[PDB]
Amino acid sequence: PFLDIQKKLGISLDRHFMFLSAEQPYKNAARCHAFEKEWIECAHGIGGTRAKKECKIEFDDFEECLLRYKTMRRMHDIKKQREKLMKEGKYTPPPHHSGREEPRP
Amino acid sequence: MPSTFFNLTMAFSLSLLGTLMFRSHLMSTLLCLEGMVLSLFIMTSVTSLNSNSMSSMPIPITILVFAACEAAVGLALLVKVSNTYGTDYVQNLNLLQC
Amino acid sequence: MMNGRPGHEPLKFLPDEARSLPPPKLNDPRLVYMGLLGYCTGLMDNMLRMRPVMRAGLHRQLLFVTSFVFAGYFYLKRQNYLYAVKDHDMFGYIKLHPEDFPEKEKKTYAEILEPFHPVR
Amino acid sequence: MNPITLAIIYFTIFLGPVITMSSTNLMLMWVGLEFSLLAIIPMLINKKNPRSTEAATKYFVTQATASMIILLAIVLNYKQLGTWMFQQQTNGLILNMTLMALSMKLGLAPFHFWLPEVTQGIPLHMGLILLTWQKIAPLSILIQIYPLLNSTIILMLAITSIFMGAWGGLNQTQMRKIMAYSSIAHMGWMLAILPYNPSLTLLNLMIYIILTAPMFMALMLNNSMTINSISLLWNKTPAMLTMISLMLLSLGGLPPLTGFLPKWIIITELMKNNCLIMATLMAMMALLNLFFYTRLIYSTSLTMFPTNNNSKMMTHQTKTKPNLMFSTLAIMSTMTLPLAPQLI
Amino acid sequence: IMKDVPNWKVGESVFHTTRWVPPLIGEMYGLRTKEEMSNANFGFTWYT
Amino acid sequence: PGIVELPTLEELKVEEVKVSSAVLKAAAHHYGAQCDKTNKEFMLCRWEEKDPRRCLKEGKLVNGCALNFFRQIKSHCAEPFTEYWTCLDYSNMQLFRHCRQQQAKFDQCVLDKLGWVRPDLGQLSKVTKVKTDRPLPENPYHSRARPEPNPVIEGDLKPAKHGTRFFFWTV
Amino acid sequence: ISAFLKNAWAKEPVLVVSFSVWGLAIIMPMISPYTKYASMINKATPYNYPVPVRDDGNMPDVPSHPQDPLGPSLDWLKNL
Amino acid sequence: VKRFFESYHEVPDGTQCHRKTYITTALGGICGIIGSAYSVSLNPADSTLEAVARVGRYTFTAAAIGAMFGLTTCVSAQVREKPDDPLNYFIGGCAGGLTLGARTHSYGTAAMGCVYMGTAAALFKIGKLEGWELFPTPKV
Amino acid sequence: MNLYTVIFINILLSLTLILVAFWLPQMNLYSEKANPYECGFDPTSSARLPFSMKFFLVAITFLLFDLEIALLLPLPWAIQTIKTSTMMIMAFILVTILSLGLAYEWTQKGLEWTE
Amino acid sequence: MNNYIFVLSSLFLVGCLGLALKPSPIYGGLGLIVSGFVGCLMVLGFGGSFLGLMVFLIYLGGMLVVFGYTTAMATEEYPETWGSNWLILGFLVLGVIMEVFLICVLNYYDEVGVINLDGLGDWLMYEVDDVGVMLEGGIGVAAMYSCATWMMVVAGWSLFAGIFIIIEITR
């Protein structure tokens, strides 16, 4: 913040709900709690300029957890190949994936 | 989520476009602004529900409150311009050109 | 640039670290110029309100000059602190990274073939 | 306005920016923006004349659109990074839109056509707030995100506004519109130097405020609002002419006066960063400002314009309007260069 | 399915970290049938 | 990057309760009293490891304890229990308040025949101690080493060299 | 002000009732033994799981079994 | 893509005339269209056919200035033996200014535009050789 | 799916009644029958002209009060908090501010219709 | 059901398109009512509840007041609908077809990206706490009475100041 009134006075008007890893009602952690925590603890201390290069792995994991682009790519590719193989006639959907399974408790 | 966010961003874009190009009635422009408000609230709501971030669900309601306050101010201004000119046409709002 | 300096304490006029610098001498040219500005401001106020420019409002003039000097002392102290901090960080960083600020060795003038351009 | 409305409205105008500059959260900075926007309008439309209503409507529409664009930026940054503050990894378009919308709020060119009209419509004592106090919040929002801004966009807007303000100043005869255009030019300098060293952006903001407030109170003194009207101060109030001249010249930016320090220091930084072309062009075009200030100086202080018979009673009657703050700010704005090192 | 696609690592994770990441419904029911997927999505919202 | 390590279908096999939600509710309180150490060890495993693949052996002990508990009930207090959970199943939300008499019958039957005692209102919800030889998982998040901070300039402040070196001002 | 209050009581009873009820709404919570118990009850309600904590051998108060005497006791709620 | 515009400096001047002329013509046309959009959005015209005529005139004028500039610059660099001499860009900018004057039916614009546009082009060339950078990024 | 089914059934029932009402009756359409109604005499002017709203101020005030309603509607879940004192103080401040705004408007004649 | 959410978002886009084209304020209000309903449905389908219902309520109230204002001030002898103006009609159809074609184009260029019509409906919900109880959005919103009191303070002040501002603008 431009003027650090809150840090100066020791109060926390709005600094406690900045990210997904902050305290949630009834201790229900948000999606990607672990990833965000890792990224932020990695990036503490070192400046932003250094973090942008030295916490990149953590940030990449975090964005993957939150948006999930690569997961969508992977599932799309798997189901695309499934469709191609099925149209060719070289694959069958197993019983458990088809609709009849031995349902587990 | 992805397709929904794309369509919502397009909706906000269209409402912004509608606001930027007028069409005589100031009330319609106010309604376009109000529609952008709707789209932004929906964006925030879906983002929060997707992330399960219940600490950020206090914020769409603040968006609604402040958008309502500004919309009320806009309506009052419409009342005043109407009292001045007899209509809400934006053409009449041209005195300050000089 | 200096906002993120480690040990920065938010919204502190003079951090305690500043007491280690020689304090301003109270007849400094800067503070004297501050007093002059205050006196001129008092005279300007008189002139604007249509008053005896130099005779009237001597309490007002005294307050103006003293207030200007009083503010100037502390502001000057803070500025000295900030420039001293800048120099401290300067030299610490340079000492830490001798590789990126190597010390140049200078050849004498005898060995340097400076071109000569006649002024004909 | 009744006292309770005065208290609440003025207190909200004061609150908004304070929230913006003391909020760590983008939504709360947006809340500060909305506070300022909502609370200013009743002060603008206090007169309830046809021009006042139209000025208030123009302000409302423009500022509401800007606020919505900024809110879109905030929401998309949330969608991306699960947080309410801009990070180095934030998408570039989000920062571009934020800069663009805060530019619209600030009045910078090419989103500048709205400011002159509103300033012309509204009375002087609110024009002061509009051209001074309402810029602190948006510029604070930018300064808090300075390391991530786009040099190309910022320089383009800055130079555009310098050129546009300089050219617009000439044609206008109205003091209110002239001060609007001066605001545009000085904001152009502020944003030009923002991405490189925001300390100097804040220095320029301070000096511009400290120069504009005295001028606005000078205009308020006799409710002057035209070149012809201000030309009559040699008769109505001779004393002020000297400081008015000095202050206009300073705003223009002549060396001995303080106005040089902002421009000189900003040019120095830009040159350090190798921004030679933009620095040269901005310095060159900042001289039309001196031209259309020198015309005012000619009209008021150096030449004596025709007066009216009825000004004699204005002479007869007494005056008690100039404040202490006028003298303080005017002197401390037009006689402070020798203390420049302490300022930067 | 992906026996012969050129470059596929069968169990490859999309995450650098080796920590366990809970599987989301898309991964869990993706290859199953539309009925199971829509159940996972709407069973509670669309009431009991 | 690395191939995930899912456990095999064979090691994900265990005898399972196959008893309905109403039955579990009816048996909950005594099932919370007896079968506490086993469940609590498994729960500590879940929370400490954070990896579902690393607590399977303890989860199967949980299942075995549940089977033992229910087998004992079926052996001794079977009919009162059937009555009790029939009455519970009938209720819309499986509320206890509707079947108290049958609850009393079942509770007395277990108390005398099997020696069990029901928990009071504030028993099953208190945090408890657990004893395990399973070592505390270090680096549970598989966290990478934290990057080292910036070096800190150390020294004592001194006045600026040759005053504020600004263009021409002497100081 | 007896006269004005008495008149208000008859000519604008609605506002008299409203202000009185608002005043009571503020006064009573401070003046009442039971107020402390609301937060205690809401803390007693166990929405989430009680996470067991590993016994390092030197934790003397937290129990090992739910039916052990040690630990918070809702007798106060039972006979509020 | 920006590849088309950055291809202008693939090979020094005096060569690939036609290509460089195309590139400058396109750039001039783009500038003209932008200016026309501004000039129609503000200061509207009575008829929509008037508006489209205005956009056509602005666009064609700007394209003509750009085409003449590129052609003359390349022709100068080719006929004379100096590839990278800013005097070439100066002559091209003067040609552009003269073409503007002709399009506007005015000799004063011809002269003023020649001087200003020629100086602008020469300074552009000088910057490209000397490594000047417009719109730099913070280095401090 | 049940709510969608029942709402669509209601829609279809209403629309079916309308269609029957429009396709069953025997009709005769002519200009005098179709022309608008105004107590047996022809319209002096169309009904699309401006119609002054004498309660505009109260109408706008309704917007803000309804948003206050929105802010207050979470109270049933709020009371299930641990910070009961904080919740109480905040709700009391909110409602008292509501009351003060209404009282100021009343004393300033906001609710008195404009003539 | 697979296309449920995408259809709702497209309907929202169409309602917003109509509003942008800006017919008479009466039709604008009707269009925004339909759009608010569709948005509430999208939020409901995304696991929300209180937020969707609140948007619907507040928007119904807002459009009520807006309609009242339009009948008085924003009126014309011949109000223009979407279809009345041929340009509005043509651009309505153009916008619909343009969005259809843009959807196709984005799908083709990025088979998986902003839009995944193939695989649509496979990513609506990401995660859910299966055995939770307190996970309802009303709880998060009510948090303003405990953990985010600053939000309440600013919003309440906004409404309070709104009262005075509106009165003095309408004086």
PDB file of N, CA and C in Angstrom, chain J residues 102-131:
ATOM      1  N   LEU J 102     -17.386 -17.115 -34.062  1.00  0.00           N
ATOM      2  CA  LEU J 102     -16.218 -16.902 -33.222  1.00  0.00           C
ATOM      3  C   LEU J 102     -15.984 -18.099 -32.310  1.00  0.00           C
ATOM      4  N   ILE J 103     -17.060 -18.680 -31.781  1.00  0.00           N
ATOM      5  CA  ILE J 103     -16.937 -19.912 -31.014  1.00  0.00           C
ATOM      6  C   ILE J 103     -16.278 -20.988 -31.861  1.00  0.00           C
ATOM      7  N   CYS J 104     -16.786 -21.184 -33.078  1.00  0.00           N
ATOM      8  CA  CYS J 104     -16.203 -22.204 -33.942  1.00  0.00           C
ATOM      9  C   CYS J 104     -14.727 -21.925 -34.198  1.00  0.00           C
ATOM     10  N   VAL J 105     -14.381 -20.663 -34.450  1.00  0.00           N
ATOM     11  CA  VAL J 105     -13.004 -20.315 -34.796  1.00  0.00           C
ATOM     12  C   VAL J 105     -12.074 -20.592 -33.627  1.00  0.00           C
ATOM     13  N   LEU J 106     -12.476 -20.182 -32.425  1.00  0.00           N
ATOM     14  CA  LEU J 106     -11.631 -20.426 -31.265  1.00  0.00           C
ATOM     15  C   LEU J 106     -11.490 -21.916 -31.001  1.00  0.00           C
ATOM     16  N   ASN J 107     -12.577 -22.673 -31.153  1.00  0.00           N
ATOM     17  CA  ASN J 107     -12.476 -24.116 -30.978  1.00  0.00           C
ATOM     18  C   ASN J 107     -11.494 -24.715 -31.972  1.00  0.00           C
ATOM     19  N   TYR J 108     -11.553 -24.276 -33.228  1.00  0.00           N
ATOM     20  CA  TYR J 108     -10.681 -24.850 -34.246  1.00  0.00           C
ATOM     21  C   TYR J 108      -9.222 -24.491 -33.997  1.00  0.00           C
ATOM     22  N   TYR J 109      -8.940 -23.218 -33.721  1.00  0.00           N
ATOM     23  CA  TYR J 109      -7.547 -22.812 -33.571  1.00  0.00           C
ATOM     24  C   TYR J 109      -6.942 -23.371 -32.289  1.00  0.00           C
ATOM     25  N   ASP J 110      -7.693 -23.356 -31.189  1.00  0.00           N
ATOM     26  CA  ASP J 110      -7.276 -23.996 -29.942  1.00  0.00           C
ATOM     27  C   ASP J 110      -8.276 -25.103 -29.647  1.00  0.00           C
ATOM     28  N   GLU J 111      -7.886 -26.340 -29.954  1.00  0.00           N
ATOM     29  CA  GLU J 111      -8.762 -27.473 -29.695  1.00  0.00           C
ATOM     30  C   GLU J 111      -9.065 -27.595 -28.209  1.00  0.00           C
ATOM     31  N   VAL J 112      -8.110 -27.223 -27.364  1.00  0.00           N
ATOM     32  CA  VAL J 112      -8.305 -27.131 -25.924  1.00  0.00           C
ATOM     33  C   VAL J 112      -7.715 -25.796 -25.499  1.00  0.00           C
ATOM     34  N   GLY J 113      -8.556 -24.913 -24.974  1.00  0.00           N
ATOM     35  CA  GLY J 113      -8.098 -23.606 -24.552  1.00  0.00           C
ATOM     36  C   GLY J 113      -9.170 -22.818 -23.834  1.00  0.00           C
ATOM     37  N   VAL J 114      -9.507 -21.645 -24.372  1.00  0.00           N
ATOM     38  CA  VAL J 114     -10.590 -20.858 -23.796  1.00  0.00           C
ATOM     39  C   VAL J 114     -11.900 -21.629 -23.874  1.00  0.00           C
ATOM     40  N   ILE J 115     -12.117 -22.344 -24.972  1.00  0.00           N
ATOM     41  CA  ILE J 115     -13.330 -23.121 -25.180  1.00  0.00           C
ATOM     42  C   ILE J 115     -12.931 -24.541 -25.539  1.00  0.00           C
ATOM     43  N   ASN J 116     -13.644 -25.508 -24.976  1.00  0.00           N
ATOM     44  CA  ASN J 116     -13.402 -26.920 -25.232  1.00  0.00           C
ATOM     45  C   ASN J 116     -14.754 -27.592 -25.473  1.00  0.00           C
ATOM     46  N   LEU J 117     -15.440 -27.164 -26.537  1.00  0.00           N
ATOM     47  CA  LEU J 117     -16.765 -27.703 -26.823  1.00  0.00           C
ATOM     48  C   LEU J 117     -16.740 -29.224 -26.799  1.00  0.00           C
ATOM     49  N   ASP J 118     -15.718 -29.820 -27.400  1.00  0.00           N
ATOM     50  CA  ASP J 118     -15.400 -31.209 -27.112  1.00  0.00           C
ATOM     51  C   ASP J 118     -14.783 -31.268 -25.724  1.00  0.00           C
ATOM     52  N   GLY J 119     -15.350 -32.087 -24.853  1.00  0.00           N
ATOM     53  CA  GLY J 119     -14.993 -32.037 -23.456  1.00  0.00           C
ATOM     54  C   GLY J 119     -15.712 -30.966 -22.675  1.00  0.00           C
ATOM     55  N   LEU J 120     -16.695 -30.305 -23.277  1.00  0.00           N
ATOM     56  CA  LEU J 120     -17.511 -29.344 -22.554  1.00  0.00           C
ATOM     57  C   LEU J 120     -18.279 -30.039 -21.440  1.00  0.00           C
ATOM     58  N   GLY J 121     -18.507 -29.306 -20.356  1.00  0.00           N
ATOM     59  CA  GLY J 121     -19.192 -29.858 -19.211  1.00  0.00           C
ATOM     60  C   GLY J 121     -18.365 -30.807 -18.380  1.00  0.00           C
ATOM     61  N   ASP J 122     -17.107 -31.028 -18.737  1.00  0.00           N
ATOM     62  CA  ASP J 122     -16.228 -31.911 -17.990  1.00  0.00           C
ATOM     63  C   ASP J 122     -15.385 -31.170 -16.965  1.00  0.00           C
ATOM     64  N   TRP J 123     -15.540 -29.849 -16.861  1.00  0.00           N
ATOM     65  CA  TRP J 123     -14.736 -29.057 -15.942  1.00  0.00           C
ATOM     66  C   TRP J 123     -15.574 -28.040 -15.190  1.00  0.00           C
ATOM     67  N   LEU J 124     -16.888 -28.234 -15.127  1.00  0.00           N
ATOM     68  CA  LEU J 124     -17.736 -27.281 -14.427  1.00  0.00           C
ATOM     69  C   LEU J 124     -17.294 -27.142 -12.976  1.00  0.00           C
ATOM     70  N   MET J 125     -17.448 -28.201 -12.191  1.00  0.00           N
ATOM     71  CA  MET J 125     -16.963 -28.230 -10.819  1.00  0.00           C
ATOM     72  C   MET J 125     -15.601 -28.903 -10.773  1.00  0.00           C
ATOM     73  N   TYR J 126     -14.697 -28.340  -9.979  1.00  0.00           N
ATOM     74  CA  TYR J 126     -13.370 -28.907  -9.800  1.00  0.00           C
ATOM     75  C   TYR J 126     -13.295 -29.790  -8.566  1.00  0.00           C
ATOM     76  N   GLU J 127     -13.657 -29.251  -7.406  1.00  0.00           N
ATOM     77  CA  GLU J 127     -13.498 -29.941  -6.138  1.00  0.00           C
ATOM     78  C   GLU J 127     -14.734 -29.701  -5.288  1.00  0.00           C
ATOM     79  N   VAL J 128     -15.043 -30.672  -4.436  1.00  0.00           N
ATOM     80  CA  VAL J 128     -16.096 -30.535  -3.441  1.00  0.00           C
ATOM     81  C   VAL J 128     -15.694 -31.316  -2.203  1.00  0.00           C
ATOM     82  N   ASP J 129     -15.982 -30.757  -1.034  1.00  0.00           N
ATOM     83  CA  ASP J 129     -15.757 -31.459   0.225  1.00  0.00           C
ATOM     84  C   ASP J 129     -16.922 -32.419   0.426  1.00  0.00           C
ATOM     85  N   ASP J 130     -16.672 -33.705   0.180  1.00  0.00           N
ATOM     86  CA  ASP J 130     -17.767 -34.662   0.090  1.00  0.00           C
ATOM     87  C   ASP J 130     -18.512 -34.797   1.410  1.00  0.00           C
ATOM     88  N   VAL J 131     -17.791 -34.865   2.523  1.00  0.00           N
ATOM     89  CA  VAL J 131     -18.401 -35.155   3.815  1.00  0.00           C
ATOM     90  C   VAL J 131     -18.505 -33.903   4.682  1.00  0.00           C
TER      91      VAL J 131
END
